[PDB]
């Protein structure tokens, strides 16, 4: 049953063209128009793409209004970062935000100093990662010992975005699914 679904489900618009000579045109082009429409929706939703270094008055808008988005429940995820330059984990998490911002343009990446965020915040609890969605806090994450701590990598951060429902599991942009071209080249030769 899955062998028929893998022709369309496991191929993007660039990979669907492989089956142009083999499979029927009406079977293939019917799905390419569907996948083409999904690509256009992501382009319209790409309202972001760099870290929004904000300040508090604005928090009451950027962090929360955005989380409502269109309010068609067009919700928008907003990853906040209570930065603290003295901590080593904070500078690591700041690099992950800019790296993920260039890839996931639909998700908003927010950064602010922790001293300016909350009155007399504990410095030991920093860096803090909050995830808003439709005005509600989906995840109040603590320091990155859960995500490896000092040895945190980009692969661990992208895996966390899938757990909170920010990115799909089978997304082609994730490093877990985005296999290298040399990897797929060896598979075709050994097939």
């Amino acid at each position: 049953a899955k062998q028929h679904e893998n022709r369309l489900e496991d191929k993007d618009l660039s990979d669907l063209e492989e089956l142009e000579d083999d499979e029927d045109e009406d079977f293939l082009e019917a799905y390419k128009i569907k996948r083409l429409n999904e690509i256009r929706k992501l382009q319209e939703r790409s309202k972001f793409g760099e870290v929004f270094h904000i300040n508090k008055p604005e928090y009451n808008k950027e962090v929360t209004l955005a989380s409502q988005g269109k309010k068609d429940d067009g919700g928008v995820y907003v990853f906040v970062h209570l930065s603290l330059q003295s901590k080593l984990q904070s500078r690591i998490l700041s690099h992950l935000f800019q790296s993920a911002a260039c890839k996931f343009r639909e998700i908003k990446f927010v950064e602010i100093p922790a001293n300016r965020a909350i009155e007399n915040y504990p410095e030991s609890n920093c860096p803090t990662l909050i995830v808003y969605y439709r005005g509600e806090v989906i995840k109040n994450m603590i320091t990155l010992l859960e995500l490896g701590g000092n040895n945190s990598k980009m692969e661990d951060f992208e895996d966390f975005m899938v757990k909170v429902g920010a990115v799909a599991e089978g997304d082609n942009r994730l490093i877990m699914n985005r296999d290298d071209e040399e990897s797929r080249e060896e598979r075709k030769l050994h097939y």
Binding site: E50, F52, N55, K56, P57, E58, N115, R116, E119
Partner: protein
Amino acid sequence: MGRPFIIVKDQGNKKRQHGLEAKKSHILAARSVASIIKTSLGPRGLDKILISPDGEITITNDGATILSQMELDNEIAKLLVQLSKSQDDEIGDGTTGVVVLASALLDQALELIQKGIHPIKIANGFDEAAKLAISKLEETCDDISASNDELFRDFLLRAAKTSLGSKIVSKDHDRFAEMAVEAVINVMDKDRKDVDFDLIKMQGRVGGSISDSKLINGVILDKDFSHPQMPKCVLPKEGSDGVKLAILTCPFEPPKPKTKHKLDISSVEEYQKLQTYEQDKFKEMIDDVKKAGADVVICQWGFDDEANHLLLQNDLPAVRWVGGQELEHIAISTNGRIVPRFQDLSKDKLGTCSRIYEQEFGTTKDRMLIIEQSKETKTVTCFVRGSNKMIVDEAERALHDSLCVVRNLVKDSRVVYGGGAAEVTMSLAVSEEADKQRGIDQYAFRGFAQALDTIPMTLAENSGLDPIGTLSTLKSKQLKEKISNIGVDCLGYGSNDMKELFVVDPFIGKKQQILLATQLCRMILKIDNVIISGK
């Protein structure tokens, strides 16, 4: 026809009621709610313990606070929750009396239903009886507006001591009643007076004892200074006794726009130039504040670090992170106005204060500022203390009820004398008209008469006096003499005349007990079908 017979969804959980027996449970359900708060009426009342689902505990005797935040199942008791609340929002007093008076009308209306009268016709009798009762109370009502401000000052104490007497705050009723009266002296205009209730703030700190509570003129802050090396108490110098309090919306920070932006930084020439830009900005910043001559600066948001030290050099303390809602109240008392930006800062828009000091409270690591004013200012803020968290909340609510009772005196000077005197006066007025207007609604007038008698009998029951001798004395005496300020003496004094006992109530407060009760019970009696969908 088949075995299934469905018209609406979830017929198993939905169940109707009908007939005389269905209405019988409604009035008897009100007796259970009334009987709980029946003992808390009058000066000899006893509080109720409340427990929330989250574990937070509070204690009180106000009927609206008791019925509020309580898990209920029956719908009629939820209407009594909304009743007491009504009187709590508009009036702020009489929340237990309106529920007991509403239950008294329902209890007397039941006997009648059983003898055999339509329910809407019963409610029509109370309406003609209620309008005649309030009309007769208005006839024998005394006005205190003709007196001067000196005698009128004393009348506020006679009413403030009444509402505070029925609470736990009455250990010193002479002392704490001045707090409720002195706060309204600072807001009244002395001609076509309006209360302006929003200016009067109210905050209480858990600490110390209740006897240490003293009224202040200013704003209470729950936060510390930007640096602890600053001086605690700040006095003025030789001239301009006002400290020139400058209030700010934008904090000490670098200027930047709201929209997303990236500042393109060129080679080393531009890198060294921007270091002089912000270093000259702080020099321009401190010169702007010293040009204005401010001594205290407060912003809603925290200043930068470097900025915390730059203020400390010139003997210029600062408080930081003052709530947005709290920031507006500071400008009104100081006779100032908040600047939008720093370029518009000038001498005219600065504040004025007598003295400030950082008050410590034991070994706790918290700081509170206490602004004081030597002259009469616009606003006023209560300063309540106590040896528990709930006793401060009880003192805040007891003071809030007294603050709303005196609020009615400002907008309406026509007062009454309650405590069983107004009830027996209004009960015999409808009784004397019952036998004149026999008709068929005479039993409704008699039920309205006996319903009003439950209030002074409840005060007689709680005070331990005999209701037979108390009710017979008031009915026999008030029928003989025309003076209508004699009621039930609950504290055990030798004389029942309330001219000497210093008890006064408002007319708008005692009126709403009858209006909201008789208007609710019309709705309670008109229910026949009762469908409750099980959750």
